[PDB]
Design a protein around this ligand. Structure first.
Ligand SMILES: N[C@@H](CC(=O)O)C(=O)O
Ligand SMILES: [Mg+2]
Ligand SMILES: [Mg+2]
Ligand SMILES: [Mg+2]
Ligand SMILES: [Mg+2]
Ligand SMILES: [Mg+2]
Ligand SMILES: [Mg+2]
Ligand SMILES: [Mg+2]
Ligand SMILES: [Mg+2]
Ligand SMILES: [Mg+2]
Ligand SMILES: [Mg+2]
Ligand SMILES: [Mg+2]
Ligand SMILES: [Mg+2]
Ligand SMILES: [Mg+2]
Ligand SMILES: [Mg+2]
Ligand SMILES: [Mg+2]
Ligand SMILES: [Mg+2]
Ligand SMILES: [Mg+2]
Ligand SMILES: [Mg+2]
Ligand SMILES: [Mg+2]
Ligand SMILES: [Mg+2]
Ligand SMILES: [Mg+2]
Ligand SMILES: [Mg+2]
Ligand SMILES: [Mg+2]
Ligand SMILES: [Mg+2]
Ligand SMILES: [Mg+2]
Ligand SMILES: [Mg+2]
Ligand SMILES: [Mg+2]
Lengths: 136, 386, 78
RNA sequence: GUGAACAGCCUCUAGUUGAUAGAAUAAUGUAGAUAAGGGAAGUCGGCAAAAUAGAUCCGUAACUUCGGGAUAAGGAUUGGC
RNA sequence: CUCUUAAGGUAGCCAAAUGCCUCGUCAUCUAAUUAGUGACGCGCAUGAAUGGAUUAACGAGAUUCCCACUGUCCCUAUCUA
RNA sequence: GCAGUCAAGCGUUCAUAGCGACAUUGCUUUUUGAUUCUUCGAUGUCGGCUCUUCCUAUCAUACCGAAGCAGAAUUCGGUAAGCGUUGGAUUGUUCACCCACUAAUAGGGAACGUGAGCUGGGUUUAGACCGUCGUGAGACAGGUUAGUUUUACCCUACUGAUGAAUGUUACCGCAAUAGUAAUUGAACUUAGUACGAGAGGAACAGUUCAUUCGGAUAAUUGGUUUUUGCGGCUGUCUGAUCAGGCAUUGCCGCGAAGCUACCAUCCGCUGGAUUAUGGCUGAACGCCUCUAAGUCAGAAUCCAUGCUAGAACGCGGUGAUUUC
């Protein structure tokens, strides 16, 4: 959430703590993301910051195009792989973890997004909705 | 030295001591402030917790992303057969608090209620109120003076009610007895209203209403002696800890040379009394009526009880109260339902609720069907069938 | 409220029941319970599981359902 | 008997049935285990546990004292009739 | 050029288990490293059988990084004797 | 380490918006010192982990005053310790330094809190290596590696748990006392508005959510398997089949009930009196002034409402009170 958040997000179960590595879903040339922080997270003793679908995280690319490595950059997750609950009572989960590299105010670095993206994420970030292939 | 890293307190200090409750029936310690204008009516009711189920309804909340869309919610049902009124009592103010001064009883007491006064019922000559009944048979001599006393004094009036335990599937046979404060005006009519209601019953509908926010008061579920970690949620010690790791490391500094009262310690867990507020009613059901689980949107004749009946309880052949969320206490425990103490707008407490669908699948497993007719339709004929 | 069909067992799924699994190819599967979810994870074939509807359809068991469709064979009379 | 095997497991001859017991199954323990998503972020430190593991076929680097490294690494198969 | 010694550290090597200042200076590994590695050396106080420098193979020796793995942890829960 | 008094100057002018030299008055024992009063027939001596409470010299949150406060942002100060103050790389580290989120990552005490609560990285015996010193035995808060961490059944404190005695027993009650709890942010709208020439750029009310904490619950999802419930599989044994034993629960899949998870769901109240401050009336002091009498409004403050126990020597109402 934050600057680009066009609306508010109901809490959904956190499945991505710090240190998690997720596939890169865009065409920016990066292949995976390494989470080191979560924007707008609280503080509690020994509580590891965690990310859920639709959040904005500060992350670095661990392996990929050299002009991207060794620097921090914002990212937005689009796939979780941990079951969470909508209002409908349906429990859903992808089969992997996926994120997209973006600037601090929500501009995507890529142009297209591979694989499905969560509805809560599309509804929260209009730009990834536009650049989104399939929305579930 | 100072604590290295700050951290919030563990546990809440407003609920000590964590000891077993005095009685299995939690006592209500506060009633809604009386208004001397409304008609005389009760302020609470008695019921037994049955179970929980799931509901689908259309949310009505302008502004939220799920305005006018279906959502699912978890609700719990309390079996509430009509109570029986037996006698009233009055309280007068004193510089040392409210004090009772006179109790009156109805002429005839049922067995299920007079069993409350015996610890060994089967060996007894059933000599209960057998001389009190002799106070009748004269016009009003021994009683009308008592009522005159209560009218002259006793600013606050409470009435005695008892549950119809035999109407429930329980194996209790011993009814529950409790006090409910009346809430009309001009106590003389309060006691009048009680007079003709002696030995008569009161349906829960006469007290509660749809979409009304209420309070649940009951004794929570017990678990026996419990370790400090699960009793208070404190951090677990590292693995390579000699002499146990399910403990608390430092139970106090050197000075003061005692362990403070604020340090988490092992002991009893559960069976405390708890008061939970702001619960919305979703459906007041009438027991002498099939299709309780039917809605205006579903329209299939089925009762509220699930397939195979509520686990550990049975059926709901009586009236019932259906409330959003969770209430303290486990199934088969007595529960008191109390009206709100204050006008709560909240833009939520006054939201009208209209159910779409009520789940009745078996809770004894991963039930797939809603009605035996549906099950037969889906599965076709079996070997058991002719 | 909409009722769906279990993608493995063919059972009906009432609201708030079972789970939903989205595969990498953006295909959507629904499951009524953990038994079916686990069997799908183990990658079993429904046609070889004796109690599923697809199996019975493939083996003509308990198939006393729909019979036929009658279309008249005569003049239209119109 | 299984099995490469005086490995581990079951049995035949032979020998024991000895170790204070009975009733319940709270906390904390000792020994044995399992956990969704993340995967060492805990900690001085991957301490403890887990992962690989038999046999047949393929493939096997730097370096070197030319003998080794080497089961390097990394893959495929294994029942019954 | 000069004082002084018997001679004035050569070949080599290094913030090394030997360097106080020192978390030396530069580069790499990481988002961030008093750690690790590669270089530089007026080296308090390295250095030649007091043995100097490498070295394939070997080590229940010490140390750094990577992959797989996992209740060490996020955050605890349950079962058996 | 922290706070004052005077005022040469800084601050476009102007001492005190904010700073403040030369001087000078104080407070603390969380630094390091001085002495050696208690302990050498022994008080277990660093740090890290976990846990409770207290202080204010206040980082944020509440309410206000001032500015070289146009708005935004920021600085100084007042009442205020209720609530919170993190996840990591390097080091045993206190400390220190960088990455990152956040409203904020404030300073300290409790025998430098805390080893019959843990660990033993360092220190701190005996082994060993290196450098310097010594002819030598050997020395080095110089470096490195390996090095046994004991006992609770007593009394007290605490968490829970019984219990004689008040004619007996049972039911329904009152409330002295003790404890107390909720906290913070974001988005939309207000509003591209107020202000400002412009660049920039708010706030009150309203709506939806979210962070930390707490009390419950299991309808749904997940976990746990001795339901040894069902099926399958390996070796061996019962002549074979069927049906079974053994392999310290043989292994694999599913697996009801119970327990359980911010890994699931629900819930967390409104009145009064005040602090700082701004005022009214009005003398002292024929004027003037919030003050002297009197009085109004006011904070996450205090006390109530509400919530948890219920004095086992605090109390009330009611039923029944034994015969050979
Ligand atoms: N007790 C010692 C130390 C003196 O001073
Ligand atoms: Mg920690
Ligand atoms: Mg502190
Ligand atoms: Mg809990
Ligand atoms: Mg140990
Ligand atoms: Mg069930
Ligand atoms: Mg399950
Ligand atoms: Mg053989
Ligand atoms: Mg053998
Ligand atoms: Mg013995
Ligand atoms: Mg083969
Ligand atoms: Mg030497
Ligand atoms: Mg001394
Ligand atoms: Mg001494
Ligand atoms: Mg002594
Ligand atoms: Mg001692
Ligand atoms: Mg102060
Ligand atoms: Mg750490
Ligand atoms: Mg001190
Ligand atoms: Mg301590
Ligand atoms: Mg101690
Ligand atoms: Mg030594
Ligand atoms: Mg010498
Ligand atoms: Mg020494
Ligand atoms: Mg002990
Ligand atoms: Mg009080
Ligand atoms: Mg279960
Ligand atoms: Mg005036």
């Amino acid at each position: 959430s934050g600057n680009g958040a066009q609306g508010t997000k109901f809490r959904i179960s956190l499945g991505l703590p710090v240190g998690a590595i997720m596939n890169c879903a865009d065409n920016s040339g990066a292949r995976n993301l390494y989470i080191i922080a979560v924007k707008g997270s609280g503080s509690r003793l020994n509580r590891l910051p965690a990310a859920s679908l639709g959040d904005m995280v500060m992350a670095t690319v661990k392996k990929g195009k050299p002009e991207l490595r060794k620097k921090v950059m914002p990212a937005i997750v689009v796939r979780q792989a941990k079951s969470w609950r909508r209002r409908d009572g349906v429990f859903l989960y992808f089969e992997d973890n996926a994120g997209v590299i973006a600037n601090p105010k929500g501009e995507m670095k890529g142009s297209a997004i591979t694989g499905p993206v969560g509805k809560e994420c599309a509804d929260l970030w209009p730009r990834v909705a536009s650049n989104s292939g399939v929305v579930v | 030295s100072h604590r290295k890293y700050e951290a919030p307190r563990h546990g809440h200090l407003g609920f000590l001591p964590r000891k077993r409750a005095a009685s299995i029936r939690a006592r209500v310690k506060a009633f809604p402030k009386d208004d001397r204008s409304k008609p005389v009516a009760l302020t609470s009711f008695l019921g037994y917790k049955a179970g929980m189920t799931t509901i689908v309804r259309d949310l009505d909340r302008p502004g939220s992303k799920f305005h006018k869309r279906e959502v699912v919610e978890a609700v719990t049902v309390v079996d509430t057969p009509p109570v029986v009124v037996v006698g009233v009592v009055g309280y007068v103010e004193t510089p040392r608090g409210l004090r009772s001064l006179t109790t009156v009883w109805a002429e005839h007491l049922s067995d299920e209620v007079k069993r409350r006064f015996y610890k060994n019922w089967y060996k007894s000559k059933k000599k209960a109120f057998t001389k009190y009944s002799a106070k009748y048979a004269q016009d009003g001599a021994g009683i009308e003076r008592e009522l005159a006393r209560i009218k002259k004094y006793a600013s606050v009036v409470r009435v005695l009610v008892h549950t119809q335990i035999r109407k429930t599937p329980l194996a209790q046979k011993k009814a529950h007895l409790a006090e409910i404060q009346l809430n009309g005006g001009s106590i003389s009519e309060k006691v009048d209203w009680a007079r003709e209601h002696f030995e008569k019953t009161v349906a829960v509908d006469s007290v509660f209403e749809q979409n009304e926010m209420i309070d649940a008061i009951a004794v929570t579920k017990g678990h026996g002696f419990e370790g400090v970690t699960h009793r208070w949620g404190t951090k677990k010690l590292p693995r390579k800890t000699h002499r146990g790791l399910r403990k608390v490391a430092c139970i106090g500094a050197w000075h003061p040379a005692h362990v403070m009262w604020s340090v988490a310690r092992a002991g009893q867990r559960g069976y405390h009394s708890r008061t939970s507020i702001n619960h919305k009613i979703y459906r007041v059901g009438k027991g002498d009526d099939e299709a309780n689980g039917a809605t205006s949107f579903d329209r299939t004749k089925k009762t509220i009880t699930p397939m195979g009946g509520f686990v550990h309880y049975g059926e709901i052949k009586n009236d019932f109260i259906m409330v959003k969320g969770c209430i303290p206490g486990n199934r088969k425990r007595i529960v008191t339902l109390r009206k709100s103490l204050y006008t709560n707008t909240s833009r939520k407490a006054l939201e009208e609720v209209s159910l779409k669908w009520i789940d009745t699948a078996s809770k004894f497993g991963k039930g797939r069907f809603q009605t035996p007719a549906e099950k037969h339709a889906f599965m076709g004929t079996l070997k058991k069938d002719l | 409220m909409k009722v769906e069909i279990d993608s493995f067992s063919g059972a009906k799924i009432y609201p708030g029941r079972g789970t939903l699994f989205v595969r990498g190819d953006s295909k959507i599967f629904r499951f009524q319970n953990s038994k079916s979810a686990s069997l799908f994870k183990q990658r079993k074939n429904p046609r070889r599981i004796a109690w599923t509807v697809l199996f019975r359809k493939h083996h003509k068991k308990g198939i006393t359902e729909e019979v036929a469709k009658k279309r008249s064979r005569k003049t239209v009379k119109a």
